[PDB]
Design a binder for this molecule. Structure first.
Ligand code: FPP
Ligand code: FPP
Lengths: 230, 231
C-alpha cells in the first residue's frame, strides 16, 4: 500500500481441467468454475481501478479439443449473459470481445453481442473477451486489410508504421493509451506465451503463479498487482 | 540417469551487464565486455549440448537513447569479437549471422559483423544469431510493408497472405523453417518483461527467468535452463 496498479491486465486462464480433475469432478465442470472465478476477478479488478481486462477465452488452437468440451465451453457465454452479465452490468462493467467471430456458434455469438449491447454505455472496467483469438492470426488479418487498403490507394505503403498496424488489430477499439496490456497474468505454473497478444504485449510485465485459475480470487489478483513493480 | 529434452532454438535476453559491473566496482561499460565474454561460454556450451540456433538480443532500437559513450563502447564490441572471439567460434564450427536493421549501424561494426559472417558461412554447427538494431514490432512492420509492396506489384495476391507467408519476410526467414521459432527464451537478471524480442517467432516459446546476471550466466546456468525446459 500503495502499489502501482496495471491499467490493462491480460489473463491466461489455465487449470480448469486440473482444478476439476483434482476434485474428482468432470473436466468441463472446471471451465464453469473458471467462469465463476472470472466474475470474482473481474469485480475485484474493477474495485482497484483497472481499466481493461483481456482474458484469453477460446484460442484458435482450441477447436481441436473433443467436440463435447467445445460444445460445453461455447455454451458458457450463454449462461454468462443470462446469469452473470446482470451483475457486471450492475457494477458498470463494459463487455467487449476481440477475436474471430465468423466461426462461432450462433447461440454463443448472440449472447456475446447482447452482452455488449447491454453494457455499451457503461463507463467502468472493460472486460475484453478474447474468443476464437490467435495473435499470429490477428496480425495476418491486419496485414491483409492493410494490403487491401494499399491496393485501393487509401494508404500508400509508406503510410505503414507501428502506429498504423496498431489501428488495425482487434484491440483497435480500445482507447490508444490502453490498447497494450501493462500486465499479463498466467496461472497454473505454465511459462509459455501461447500466442496471446503477441503484438500488444510486446513490452508487458509477466506474472506467473501456480494457483489454478478457478482458485484465482481477489486475494490472488492482489498478490499479482502488488508484484507488478515497474 | 535420463535424458532431458533440449531446445533446438534458444532466444536469450542478456540483462544485468550494468548491475554486474556496479556490483563489482567496475565501470558500467566493462560489464558489457563481460557480457560478451559470457556469450562465448554460453555459445560454446550450447554447441556442446547440440542446440541448433541461439538468438541473443544484443542491441534493441530503444537502446540508442543511452549515452553516446555507452553506445560507442557497445558498438566497438563486435570489432573485438571479430578479432578476439570469432576465430574460436569458427574453430568450434559456429555459424555467425545477424538480424536487425543494419543500415543504421557504424561502419567498423557492420564490417566486423559481415566479415564474421563471411568467415563462418560454411560452418555447420550451432548458429549464433546476433539481434542488433532489432525490434519485434519494427521487424513485423518491415515484413508487413514489403508484402504490401509485393501485393501492389501483383507478385502475391492478397489471397496468398497467410501466417506461413508473413514468417518468410521476418528477419528470421534465413533460418531453416523448423528452426525459425525459438523453443526457449531465457531472460536473466530477474526481469519478467518481454521487451519486444521476437514477438512473432516466440509466440509459443517456453520462458525461463533467472535472477542470475548475464555476465555470470555460464555452462552451468545454461544447463539449469535446458533442464527446466520440460516440454
Ligand atoms: C467466454 C466466457 C464466458 C468465458 C468464461 C470462462 C471460460 C469459458 C474459460 C475457459 C477457458 C479455457 C478454454 C481454459 C482451458 O483451460 P485448460 O483445460 O487448459 O486447464 P488445464 O491446463 O487444467 O487442462
Ligand atoms: C558481439 C556483440 C554484439 C557483443 C555484445 C555483447 C553484449 C555487451 C551484450 C549486452 C547488450 C546490452 C545492451 C546489455 C545492457 O544490459 P543492461 O544491464 O543495461 O539491462 P536492462 O535493459 O535490464 O537495464
Amino acid at each position: 500500500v500503495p502499489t502501482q496498479v496495471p491499467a490493462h491486465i491480460g489473463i491466461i486462464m489455465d487449470g480448469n481441467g486440473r482444478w476439476a480433475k483434482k476434485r474428482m469432478q468432470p473436466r468441463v465442470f472446471g471451465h464453469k468454475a473458471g467462469m465463476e472465478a472470472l466474475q470474482t476477478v473481474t469485480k475485484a479488478a474493477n474495485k482497484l481501478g483497472v481499466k481493461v481486462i483481456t482474458v484469453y477465452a477460446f484460442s484458435t488452437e482450441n477447436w481441436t479439443r473433443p467436440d463435447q468440451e467445445v460444445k460445453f465451453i461455447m455454451n458458457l457465454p450463454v449462461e454468462f449473459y443470462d446469469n452473470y452479465v446482470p451483475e457486471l452490468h450492475a457494477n458498470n462493467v463494459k463487455i467487449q470481445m476481440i477475436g474471430e467471430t465468423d466461426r462461432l456458434p450462433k447461440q454463443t455469438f448472440e449472447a456475446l453481442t447482447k452482452a455488449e449491447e447491454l453494457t455499451k454505455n457503461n463507463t467502468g472496467l472493460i472486460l475484453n473477451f478474447a474468443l476464437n483469438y490467435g495473435g499470429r492470426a490477428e496480425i495476418t488479418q491486419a496485414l491483409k486489410l492493410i494490403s487491401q487498403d494499399v491496393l485501393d490507394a487509401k494508404i500508400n505503403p509508406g503510410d505503414i508504421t507501428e502506429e498504423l498496424i496498431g489501428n488495425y488489430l482487434f484491440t483497435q477499439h480500445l482507447p490508444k493509451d490502453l490498447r497494450d496490456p501493462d500486465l499479463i497474468i498466467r496461472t497454473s505454473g505454465e511459462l509459455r506465451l501461447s500466442n496471446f497478444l503477441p503484438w500488444q504485449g510486446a513490452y508487458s510485465e509477466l506474472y506467473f503463479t501456480d494457483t489454478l485459475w478457478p482458485d484465482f480470487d481477489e486475494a490472488a489478483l492482489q498478490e499479482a498487482i502488488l508484484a507488478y513493480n515497474r
